[PDB]
């Protein structure tokens, strides 16, 4: 049936884990019910919609999805909406933001034997070894800080290695 080839065209719209329409036809302060994506009704927790940060702007009808975390884990499309639609700072891992031009929010907490720093407004990466920041100085920046700049410095396994740089030095 190439009549479902106009639905093979509906297949195109959004299909693999990526930005999707995100129909919020059902809503409740218990489990925000997402619907669009691939499978039918969903069951996602809440971290930017209700009971999460206090922002109630997902009023029944908002259309944000959750980057289809799973195409279908068995009658289960996507899950927690940590930073899935507006991943303005990271996406894959960090190497590709979206503009990289304007100073995006950045935080530089040093290595307390690891780091455990929310370096980006959206992720929290642990960094390996020296050059944890850009290198004016390595282990002497444990303040969250403010919006100064943002650049890359040293990735590793390209998973949770999000590397941010904001000291306005010679930008090494």
């Amino acid at each position: 049936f190439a009549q479902l080839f106009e639905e093979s065209l509906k297949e195109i719209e959004t299909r693999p884990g990526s930005i999707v329409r995100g129909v919020v036809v059902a809503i409740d302060k218990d489990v925000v019910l997402v619907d669009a994506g691939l499978k039918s009704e969903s069951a996602i927790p809440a971290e930017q919609f209700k009971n999460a940060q206090g922002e109630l702007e997902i009023q029944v009808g908002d259309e944000v999805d959750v980057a289809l975390d799973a195409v279908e884990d068995g009658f289960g499309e996507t899950l927690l909406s940590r930073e899935k639609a507006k991943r303005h700072e990271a996406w894959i891992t960090l190497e590709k933001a979206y503009e990289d031009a304007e100073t995006v929010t950045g935080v530089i907490n040093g290595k307390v034997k690891g780091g455990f720093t929310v370096e980006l407004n959206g992720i929290r990466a642990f960094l390996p070894g020296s050059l944890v920041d850009v290198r004016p100085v390595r282990d002497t920046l444990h303040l969250e800080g403010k919006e100064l700049e943002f650049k890359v410095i040293k990735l590793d396994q390209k998973r949770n290695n999000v590397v941010v740089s904001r000291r306005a030095v010679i930008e090494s």
């Binding site: 049936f1 479902l4 639905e7 691939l38 279908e72």
Partner: peptide, 19 residues
């Protein structure tokens, strides 16, 4: 027909590793 069946999702089936 296929019209309502798809604007709903009757075409979905589990993973091909459970079927």
């Amino acid at each position: 027909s296929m019209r309502d069946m798809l604007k709903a999702g009757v075409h979905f089936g589990h993973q091909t590793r459970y079927w």
